[PDB]
Amino acid sequence: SDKELKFLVVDDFSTMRRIVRNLLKELGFNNVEEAEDGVDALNKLQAGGYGFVISAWNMPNMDGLELLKTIRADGAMSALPVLMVTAEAKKENIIAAAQAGASGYVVKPFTAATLEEKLNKIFEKLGM
Numbered sequence: 001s002d003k004e005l006k007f008l009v010v011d012d013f014s015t016m017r018r019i020v021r022n023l024l025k026e027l028g029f030n031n032v033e034e035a036e037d038g039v040d041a042l043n044k045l046q047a048g049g050y051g052f053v054i055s056a057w058n059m060p061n062m063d064g065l066e067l068l069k070t071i072r073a074d075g076a077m078s079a080l081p082v083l084m085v086t087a088e089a090k091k092e093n094i095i096a097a098a099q100a101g102a103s104g105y106v107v108k109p110f111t112a113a114t115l116e117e118k119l120n121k122i123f124e125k126l127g128m
Helices: 014-027 038-045 064-073 091-100 112-124
Strands: 007-010 032-035 052-056 082-086 104-107
Touching: 007 014, 007 038, 014 032, 014 112, 032 038, 038 052, 038 064, 052 064, 064 082, 064 091, 082 112, 104 112
Parallel strands: 007 032, 007 052, 052 082, 082 104
Antiparallel strands: none
16 A cells, blocks of 8 residues: 555564564554564454564464464465564575565564565565
8 A cells, every 4th residue: 555554563572563663654654553473463464454464483372484374374364465574594484484475574683774675575576
């Protein structure tokens, strides 16, 4: 959408959620909500309206990969862009994510410039 595309930031670390929240505000994206794990994220996603999901890979209860796989299998939100936030770039993890449907991955920490690039690449490789 425009700057009003509604984001769901998912991370069990509240500090990270605020960090991502503020990097998006700096870019002009003010419509952000948060979730603390995969289950909490699915519960909010069921309300619809969401346009992008930024999710941490390691979370207790339902990690980012399981949250991704579930999103993709849901007919109503199977096209939802999902950006995976990780702490290290391991080959097998990047491929497991990619083959499961991840729109992209970003290694933390990252700046607003890095996030903007990752967002832009996801939009064009999709048609936005």
